[PDB]
Design a protein around this ligand. Sequence first.
Ligand SMILES: CCOC(=O)c1cnn2cccc(C#CC3CC3)c12
Lengths: 555, 416
Amino acid sequence: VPISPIETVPVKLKPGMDGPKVKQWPLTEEKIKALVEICTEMEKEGKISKIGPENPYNTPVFAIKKKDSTKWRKLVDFRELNKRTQDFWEVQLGIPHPAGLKKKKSVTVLDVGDAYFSVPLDEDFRKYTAFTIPSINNETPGIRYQYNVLPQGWKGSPAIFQSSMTKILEPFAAQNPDIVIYQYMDDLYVGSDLEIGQHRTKIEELRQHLLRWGLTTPDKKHQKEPPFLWMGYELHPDKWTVQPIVLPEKDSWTVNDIQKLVGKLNWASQIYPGIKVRQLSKLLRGTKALTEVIPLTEEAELELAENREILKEPVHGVYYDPSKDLIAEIQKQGQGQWTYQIYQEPFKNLKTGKYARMRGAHTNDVKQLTEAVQKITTESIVIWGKTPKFKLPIQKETWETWWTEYWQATWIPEWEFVNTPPLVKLWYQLEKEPIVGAETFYVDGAANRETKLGKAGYVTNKGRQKVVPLTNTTNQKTELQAIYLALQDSGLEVNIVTDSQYALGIIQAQPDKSESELVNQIIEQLIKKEKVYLAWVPAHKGIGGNEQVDKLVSA
Amino acid sequence: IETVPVKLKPGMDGPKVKQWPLTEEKIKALVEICTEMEKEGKISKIGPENPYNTPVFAIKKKDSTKWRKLVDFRELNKRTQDFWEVQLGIPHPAGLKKKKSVTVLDVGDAYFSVPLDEDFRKYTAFTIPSINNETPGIRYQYNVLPQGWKGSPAIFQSSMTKILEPFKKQNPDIVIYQYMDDLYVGSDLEIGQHRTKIEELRQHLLRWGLTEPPFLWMGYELHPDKWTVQPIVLPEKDSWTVNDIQKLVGKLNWASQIYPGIKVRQLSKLLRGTKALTEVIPLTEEAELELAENREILKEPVHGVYYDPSKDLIAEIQKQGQGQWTYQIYQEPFKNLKTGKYARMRGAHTNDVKQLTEAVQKITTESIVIWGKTPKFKLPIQKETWETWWTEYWQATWIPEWEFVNTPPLVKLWYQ
Ligand SMILES: CCOC(=O)c1cnn2cccc(C#CC3CC3)c12
């Protein structure tokens, strides 16, 4: 029975660079005796070949003891050759998410670990894979060898293997559309939606198809049945979840102890609803000092204690059914926290997740909800190839007022309101025109940049005025303080005239929460008002009210 | 044919741009399109020894119910040599922007008949992604001139002038310009006869093509002699409120950065006190004087403004609400080369991003007709929202560059 030849992939070195010439380290006699035995068997299998002294390249080789078994293991240090090898199209960059796996009746895993060292290497590239087995007592030249197949640990071997395996599996998948095959390292995941009797028959057909290229896979019942242990998940036949993470308790948490926490909670948040990690991730700023056992925050242990009520009972996700709509629900959790669940029928989720607000100076809930929708949208297109329908905690009228008056263009895909508090709302809305019968407050601020001394205040049309002296302030700070005084001292409706482009830029961004306490105070004032018209005029232009309060403030 | 000496710029590697996620409908369409293209020899499968990549997606122009393949060659186009050995950039037809009826043709399919440099094909690599990474991405590289690449019109420029020589000699009043995959054709006659004599130009490519049939079916018809110019205009009122005079003084202060003789001393004099915003202020004839000179100053063009082909064109867009969008094209601040407004957009009365998106396309088309160059956009939209949705509404075969404005500009009201 002749074997079909696996077509070789032409591989070149990086332009200008040469191959490796790193010398060989001295090994003990038992290590050398073990390598000679290994390399003799590999040579009999065609994997490697003895080369003459005309090959001037070398790659260091080692021998490491296998666990339990007394038999040694061979290892080549291709690190230097991988630095001089061309770039490849890495195809294993993204792995499937379990939530996107379609419902299949029977799934089978095939181990093709032998095939990795059975894929030929480019004939013109083997000369750069040369390595040397040092001789006993260094009294004869080392046994020179070069690889004929894809060497374990070479930069291009993972990509060339999958590409070679894909070309082999193409005719079978084409002539078997009821068969879904997924390849990953030395594993073949073959599932189908038919009866088990027709499954193992088509499974056997795949074995003979692979035998044509000399690739044999175990026939006896594999020790890896649902659920699988694949990339941190548990792949049961009907459901999926993360590998159980018993996140531990600790008396004194350090930098590496909380980074072990931070990583492990974000992994569990894809199936466990309502996971929060920010207060724990808040303990990571500055340099990455491994000798710093930072104390804990009280607002990090009570939120930790909340992560346990979710991580106590096992929660599973279902698989994707393309015949039912895809839904995504969002909840506001506070302090820039959003959580989401993607599902198709009530009670059972496909996956969950969280979104953290971007580090910014000013923000509001509507912006944050929008960004989370875009995130869920991009992740859904990856996993399922379609945008889900959204259930959002925001009234249709609220969103309509927001997007029609927002200065930016903004949009969210098809969505419906879900009455699940806390509801995202507009806390204030400025007027488009001046308010008749409302007092007009002309405000201004000014600070001395040298002594940090400043003043802020207002003058109104009813003769009301105020000027407050300030210490440890700036021009920008007094401009905001002026507006705050006007809001603090006016009735329910008020017109405010300012010259501060700085303040307008903040307010026209329409925040509801700020890192600046002065902005937050302004916001609390705006919320209490009925109507607020904020007008801008240019400074130092002799504009009355503004000019007459510019002199009082810069006095 | 069979000869196209083309390489990369010295000191630059090929594009390695990541493919962004695609919906199921677009992946299937790209699979169908590319399967046929592979059979016609337009593209070939490639192995992992090709690391380069350029993103691809599908485009469904409302003119047809079939999908089109769009390759975003922006990164590649920056990295290929400038084709001056052919032409040092054919002088942009200034008669294009002085025409009443300019129509665009998609002559991109004509590029597919000319082969591409065998050593250059590796740089046109692209990936059809799979859903959920369930299968490796289907990878292809172009064998002929790709649609959207800068080198495709530059190489085809020798052949394109030969198919058009009889038509150009038959009508020297008609000026033809080519940008990327588009042919810009202008005429000054009736619309009913316009579409017929454009079909005369259309049938030159069919006779050359044969040497469903793939040729031209649609023509997006523009009228660049009926386009928007937006001068700075001041209100005309019989009674002015304090608020009215504040906004006017602010507008005039802003326009004084563009025009020199703009004075606001006498109008700010009207705001002599601390009055209520809605209080009507009578205009003193000395301030009415000052408003008159400013009005006449705004009638004249901007002083010392010019176009420089070495510098980049910048387009800023403002959202004005209720479908209105204002824009300015410039190179130096306050030296605008063109301003305009867009009142209504095709549908999208509930979709802001669709409106902005096709506003960007219109502004780019206008920029191509006037200067033969696309501008760099400053977009009033969060990056994550734009990047998520602009491909769903795109139509043009080219793609410009853009940045994102995250601070609300104060000058929105002055262009309104
Ligand atoms: C043929 C791939 O198998 C499926 O599409 C599938 C369907 N149901 N199901 C249940 C458990 C495990 C897998 C899996 C897998 C591969 C590792 C990704 C699975």
